[PDB]
Amino acid sequence: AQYDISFADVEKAHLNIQDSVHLTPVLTSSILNQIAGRNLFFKCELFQKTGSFKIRGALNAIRGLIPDTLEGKPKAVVTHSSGNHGQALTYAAKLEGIPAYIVVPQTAPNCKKLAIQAYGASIVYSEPSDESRENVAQRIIQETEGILVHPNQEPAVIAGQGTIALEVLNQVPLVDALVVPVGGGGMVAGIAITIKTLKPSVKVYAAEPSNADDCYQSKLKGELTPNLHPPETIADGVKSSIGLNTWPIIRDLVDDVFTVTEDEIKYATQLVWERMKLLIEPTAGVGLAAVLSQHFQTVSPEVKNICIVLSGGNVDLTSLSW
Amino acid sequence: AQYDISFADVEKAHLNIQDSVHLTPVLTSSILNQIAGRNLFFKCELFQKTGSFKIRGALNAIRGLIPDTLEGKPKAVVTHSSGNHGQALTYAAKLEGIPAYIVVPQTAPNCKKLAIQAYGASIVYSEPSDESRENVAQRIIQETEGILVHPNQEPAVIAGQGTIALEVLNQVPLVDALVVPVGGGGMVAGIAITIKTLKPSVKVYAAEPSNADDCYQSKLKGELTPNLHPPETIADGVKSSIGLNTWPIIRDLVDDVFTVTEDEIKYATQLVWERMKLLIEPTAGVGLAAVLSQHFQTVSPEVKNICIVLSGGNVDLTSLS
Numbered sequence: 001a002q003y004d005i006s007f008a009d010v011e012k013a014h015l016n017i018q019d020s021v022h023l024t025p026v027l028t029s030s031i032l033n034q035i036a037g038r039n040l041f042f043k044c045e046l047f048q049k050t051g052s053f054k055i056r057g058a059l060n061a062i063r064g065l066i067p068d069t070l071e072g073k074p075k076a077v078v079t080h081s082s083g084n085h086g087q088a089l090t091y092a093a094k095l096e097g098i099p100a101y102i103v104v105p106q107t108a109p110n111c112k113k114l115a116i117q118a119y120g121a122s123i124v125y126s127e128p129s130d131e132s133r134e135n136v137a138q139r140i141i142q143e144t145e146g147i148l149v150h151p152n153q154e155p156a157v158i159a160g161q162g163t164i165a166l167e168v169l170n171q172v173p174l175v176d177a178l179v180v181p182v183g184g185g186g187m188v189a190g191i192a193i194t195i196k197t198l199k200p201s202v203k204v205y206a207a208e209p210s211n212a213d214d215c216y217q218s219k220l221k222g223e224l225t226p227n228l229h230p231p232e233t234i235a236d237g238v239k240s241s242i243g244l245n246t247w248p249i250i251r252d253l254v255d256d257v258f259t260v261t262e263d264e265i266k267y268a269t270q271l272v273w274e275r276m277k278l279l280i281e282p283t284a285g286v287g288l289a290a291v292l293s294q295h296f297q298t299v300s301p302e303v304k305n306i307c308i309v310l311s312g313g314n315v316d317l318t319s320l321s322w
Numbered sequence: 323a324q325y326d327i328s329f330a331d332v333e334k335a336h337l338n339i340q341d342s343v344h345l346t347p348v349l350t351s352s353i354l355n356q357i358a359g360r361n362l363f364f365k366c367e368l369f370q371k372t373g374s375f376k377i378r379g380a381l382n383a384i385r386g387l388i389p390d391t392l393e394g395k396p397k398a399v400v401t402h403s404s405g406n407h408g409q410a411l412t413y414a415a416k417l418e419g420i421p422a423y424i425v426v427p428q429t430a431p432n433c434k435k436l437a438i439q440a441y442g443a444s445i446v447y448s449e450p451s452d453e454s455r456e457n458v459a460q461r462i463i464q465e466t467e468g469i470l471v472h473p474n475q476e477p478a479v480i481a482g483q484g485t486i487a488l489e490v491l492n493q494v495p496l497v498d499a500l501v502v503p504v505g506g507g508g509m510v511a512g513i514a515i516t517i518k519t520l521k522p523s524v525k526v527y528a529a530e531p532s533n534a535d536d537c538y539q540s541k542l543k544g545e546l547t548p549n550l551h552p553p554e555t556i557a558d559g560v561k562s563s564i565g566l567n568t569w570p571i572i573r574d575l576v577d578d579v580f581t582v583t584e585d586e587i588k589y590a591t592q593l594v595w596e597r598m599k600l601l602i603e604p605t606a607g608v609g610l611a612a613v614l615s616q617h618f619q620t621v622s623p624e625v626k627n628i629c630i631v632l633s634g635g636n637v638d639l640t641s642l643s
């Protein structure tokens with residue numbers, strides 16, 4: 001029973017990040033409660049700094065490096081990202097006063113790149129040729145003597161994410177289950193370690209697009225089974241597969257994985273928009289879709305109080321489904 | 323000096339409705355503060371039951387006007403107003419165990435008729451004659467022994483709306499001004515009465531589309547001056563002109579009216595969506611638009627803490643600008 005993080009790592013992460021992240025509210029909806037047949041509690045990480053929960057893990061993995069003086073601090077951080085991870089890493093870098101660089105091609109949206117240097121990180125353009133971006137990033141690191149930061153599930157990132165569960169437990173002490181969207185698995189793994197240490201009777205459920213169901217298949221097969229090919233889904237925040245760092249935790253401490261169709265993600269996201277007035281991105285609708293899915297009916301009526309993590313609000317408004 | 327509601331009406335409204343309405347939170351945005359150059363406080367009535375503040379006035383209208391015996395309670399409610407008022411009134415009627423009727427023009431959109439049925443009101447049809455409408459209304463009123471509940475001119479409705487300001491004063495103790503979207507003027511009138519009673523040093527500003535600028539024009543001219551023609555604006559919640567009951571209060575107790583273009587409303591609404599992740603309807607973006615407008619730069623630098631009323635979140639997600 002060895003995992004990359006412990007409960008202690010999550011408590012330390014809490015102390016490390018508390019002054020720089022929002023302790024986000026839990027909101028409720030009577031009408032959503034009646035549709036689900038459960039008492040629903042929405043943990044509002046869409047209100048978090050940068051528009052998603054990411055900042056938690058990213059700040060803990062950047063701030064928890066300085067030994068004391070200005071000798072073991074990163075000279076610079078370099079990334080490709082562009083999405084929610086990019087926004088998180090960059091903001092974390094600004095807070096710590098670390099020069100930050102983002103390598104992007106002419107494919108990312110205007111709103112996203114405006115919100116990527118919205119935290120003052122130098123934008124370097126590489127020609128849209130995939131492997132062309134690797135050489136430019138290596139050149140930045142050469143000049144700065146800094147570090148490359150790619151989308152990660154390092155211990156410090158998982159522990160930072162676990163802090164969501166610490167707040168949920170204080171905000172809804174009678175919670176019977178947490179429902180968490182799953183991509184690389186960092187969020188659900190951190191929550192799982194936290195929840196199962198403090199209150200082992202509370203359920204931890206993963207929510208996953210069926211078009212990107214590596215986590216579901218992994219649990220089924222009993223071994224790490226990453227996506228065959230880059231999945232196509234509106235839930236763009238959960239496209240990456242679970243990894244070596246999150247698999248053991250997901251295998252043992254996540255009670256079940258609930259898959260949801262593209263239509264179910266769309267309906268659920270629209271439902272939150274219309275009844276709760278919360279501008280969640282479709283990835284954050286996955287959790288509600290899981291709670292409303294046919295398969296979730298197998299879950300006990302005793303599991304009445306359910307916390308859904310609304311993981312982000314970074315919607316690309318220039319694009320629409322319905 | 324003497325108006326259709328008093329401060330006492332507002333306090334009674336609070337007692338009337340407090341067990342059944344949300345005390346909605348005040349949210350802040352540091353990036354919005356930097357854009358505006360002032361400290362902004364967003365009263366989140368979009369989180370209110372039915373998706374707008376109007377539940378406050380609608381419910382107070384039912385619970386207020388009562389001959390105080392077991393034999394003396396409204397037996398039904400009626401309105402010509404569909405949209406936010408119709409939805410709020412129906413919801414309040416259900417709370418009270420009472421039927422609600424919306425007088426609907428027979429040529430109204432299919433989708434609006436379905437939405438009215440969906441939230442539990444009986445539709446009664448009329449001609450768009452503005453003479454047969456009140457004819458059908460008064461016919462229902464007599465049939466049902468019910469009361470007509472106007473969206474903005476009814477005293478009990480105005481009083482209910484003012485309870486917003488009670489919460490704002492408790493939630494933002496150092497508030498310097500409230501910025502309130504104005505349509506019929508029920509909300510701004512109720513808020514003005516409340517603010518000018520409890521802390522008159524606090525400014526009350528009305529925010530209005532220039533495409534529907536009757537409140538601005540009325541204040542300028544010094545008399546009630548309705549919109550000449552139906553307003554053409556994305557702020558669908560504030561198309562109504564101010565009326566006989568709201569004008570006197572606005573005249574004396576509203577400090578100024580700030581007008582905003584359609585592009586300013588659209589941009590400020592998008593700003594709230596993108597920066598705050600709050601799905602406000604464009605009508606609710608009117609207040610922020612006012613704060614960001616060039617004319618608002620004339621407002622004294624002392625007026626630093628500004629509460630903007632995010633009045634509603636009932637946006638039709640089938641059409642984007």
Ligand SMILES: *Cc1c(COP(=O)(O)O)cnc(C)c1O
Pocket residue numbers: 052054084085181182183184185186187188237238281283284311312313
């Ligand atoms: C990154 C992300 C996730 C998934 O979290 P993992 O830890 O990667 O599983 C879910 N939702 C949103 C909005 C995200 O940005």
Ligand SMILES: *Cc1c(COP(=O)(O)O)cnc(C)c1O
Pocket residue numbers: 374376406407473474503504505506507508509510559560562603605606633634635
């Ligand atoms: C009706 C309405 C208004 C205007 O209120 P009045 O009391 O008519 O001035 C503002 N915002 C929203 C969301 C509304 O529904």
Ligand SMILES: [Mn+2]
Pocket residue numbers: 182183208209212213214215238239240241242
């Ligand atoms: Mn997956």
Ligand SMILES: [Mn+2]
Pocket residue numbers: 504505530531534535536537560561562563564
């Ligand atoms: Mn007007």
